Amino acid sequence: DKLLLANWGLPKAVLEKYHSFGVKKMFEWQAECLLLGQVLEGKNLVYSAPTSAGKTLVAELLILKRVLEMRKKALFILPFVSVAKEKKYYLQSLFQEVGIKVDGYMGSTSPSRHFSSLDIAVCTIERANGLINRLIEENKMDLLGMVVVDELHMLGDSHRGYLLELLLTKICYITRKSASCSNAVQIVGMSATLPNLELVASWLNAELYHTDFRPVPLLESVKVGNSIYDSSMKLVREFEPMLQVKGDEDHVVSLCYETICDNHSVLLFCPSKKWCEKLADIIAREFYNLHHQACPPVILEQKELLEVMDQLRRLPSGLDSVLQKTVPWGVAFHHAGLTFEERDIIEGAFRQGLIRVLAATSTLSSGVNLPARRVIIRTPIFGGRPLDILTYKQMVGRAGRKGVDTVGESILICKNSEKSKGIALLQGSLKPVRSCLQRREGEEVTGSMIRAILEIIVGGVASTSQDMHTYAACTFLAASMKVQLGAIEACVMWLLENEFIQSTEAGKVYHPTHLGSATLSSSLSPADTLDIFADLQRAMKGFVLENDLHILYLVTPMFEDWTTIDWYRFFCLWEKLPTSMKRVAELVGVEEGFLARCVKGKVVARTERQHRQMAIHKRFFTSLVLLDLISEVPLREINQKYGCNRGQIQSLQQSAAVYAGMITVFSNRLGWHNMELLLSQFQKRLTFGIQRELCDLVRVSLLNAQRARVLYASGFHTVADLARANIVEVEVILKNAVPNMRTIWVTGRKGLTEREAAALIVEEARMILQQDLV
């Protein structure tokens, strides 16, 4: 037998840690994937297995093979910051004991370790591409030995999807060019079972592995009326409801209750925030009725659920008025309107089995591993459309708790009017992946192709048109075709006419300008960079230093439907808005006659002139919300003042802090030294949402804006003075100022006691000095 990780011969420290995770023995498919010929010898690999099959273990063992037997660095590229955070702390708590230094590049976060000191960088797609562009700039591509790509099916039709192709095409081009005129950078890709996954493997010259193995079977089925029908439209059951819930006709509450009697846990995907909250309220009342009616009674581990409510109540947002009534029973909800900290606690309490029913929006289906014993889906229609089969299979694939269940179950609840949509979701299979670089009818260029051509010219890895046609032959567009020769020339002509690149006589040799080099280094989209450049110049002709709002208008993103603006509120603020802020508004182009039109009725954009005229006002409203964040105005007071949800504000922080970083590097490369001197404070300041003084203390990763303000209020104004602090004094400050059941929540950890958090804070401050002095 050679399926035990001990016989595979891993380092002792990771082996013992894997045993502590229960990973005693790998699946036959993982061994068969790792023994797939040259895969263990550096050839690229692409494999697809169900997410619950433990698919990432194969990538983790290949990272060891490329960071130990070669002392070369590896990227781990992930679709979302939460997944990147979770994977970062998992990899750290696994590999740190062999000395492999894991850190990561995700959102506005950046490591205090320089990349030369890393072995593994856990990246989001956008931060990975920015990293590779810098390694090309530095001529340090010799430092990479691997790239691991999760969710490689993201490669198609997505706003950050093509960045994954633009990354992998550059890695392929530079390596294959170096060989043509051992695989240097092993790419490991993980995907859904796309029908054209052979093509992606052949594009990457990868070995392909596919399996449909799941560690527990999956009774994927549909319910209509009382009848529950199989995917083949055999009858599975006729559902007698255990509970006569009078308020709801689809029996969903009794369909949850049916398995809760077994002490199993249910996950319940709902079309919308209000449908989740309405449904979680109903289910909790039926558990309350059932408890007094006591059809077995529920046992709820009640003392632990009280701790969950205490942790929630000690967040800056407090205990949600709907969570207050549901959570005591082990019923809750999970939706994009909650904070990240509320969601992380509620995800944790569901994982621990304290919360037994969770009504969730579709956004849970991608960003977390929550295994559930039933996955109910309340309708085949979501957001006014049929479900995407990728989303539906991301939902249903969460049925079955690995090693706990015999089989997973999923019920699509379906009306008689919807049965044809329902069966189509059950039987349907994913669309083949197709790249964004296919310019549509009526398009001469695409922003993805322009960025591709810019990155190679400004990076210098393609200089002539002979090289640009050679680069394109490495593209998944070409591999899918195997027009494009014209698409290259059209993109070159746009960059030339604006002089992001300058043409010179040899054929033609093309070189960047400073505007090209700045737009590359910023990672801004070059089509937008013409507006950003002209905006920043026009600000420098006359900048209002009188407040930070004119800076916030420049670092705030373009509007992204992050909220629905209440224009009657906005104009009623525009009266009270301070004159030092209405002076900014005049400079940036906000107009109160157009606000009156927005109050008067619907306003629309027929022209690009009218599109920006509206964007200017939405961008100003966003900058006011940021100005309240930047001044530590509580999220409840921002909500009441502007109408935003907590999760809308907290997600605006992430994009504004990312964008504040880009605009700093853009101004730095152009040499607007007076702008970068002003802008550079705002990335950290927006990320946490703090005054200028907290910005030093916040360097401690245990301190958020709340904990930094209580330490600043006590007198620990700086990290050096905090490192001096007596641990008992930090304890007493936290013990007093925050208002042992894990009082404090730390996003990288479970909840901490006051004694544990205070000691870790002081020792982390001392370590930061050691790292800063070194």
From Swiss-Prot:
Q: Where is it made, tissue-wise?
A: Highly expressed in testis.
Where, subcellularly, is it found?
Answer: Nucleus; Chromosome
Q: Where is this region: Interaction with RAD51?
A: 740-774
Tell me the residue numbers annotated for binding ATP.
Q30, A49, P50, T51, S52, A53, G54, K55, T56
Q: What is the effect of changing K55M?
A: Abolished ATPase activity
Which residue intervals define the domain Helicase C-terminal in the entry? 247-472
Query: Tied to what disorder?
Result: Breast cancer: A common malignancy originating from breast epithelial tissue. Breast neoplasms can be distinguished by their histologic pattern. Invasive ductal carcinoma is by far the most common type. Breast cancer is etiologically and genetically heterogeneous. Important genetic factors have been indicated by familial occurrence and bilateral involvement. Mutations at more than one locus can be involved in different families or even in the same case.
Q: Quaternary structure per UniProt?
A: Homomultimer; forms homodimers and homotetramers. Interacts with RAD51. Interacts with ORC2 and ORC4. Interacts with RHNO1; interaction takes place during mitosis and promotes POLQ recruitment to DNA damage sites. Interacts (when phosphorylated) with TOPBP1 (via BRCT domains 7 and 8); promoting POLQ recruitment to DNA damage sites.
Which family does the entry's similarity section mention? Belongs to the DNA polymerase type-A family.
UniProt remark on domains: The loop 2 region is involved in the binding of the 2 ends of resected double-strand breaks and homomultimerization.
Provide the protein name. DNA polymerase theta
**What is the species listed in this Swiss-Prot or TrEMBL entry?**
Homo sapiens (Human)
| Full-sequence range covered | 67 to 892 of 2590
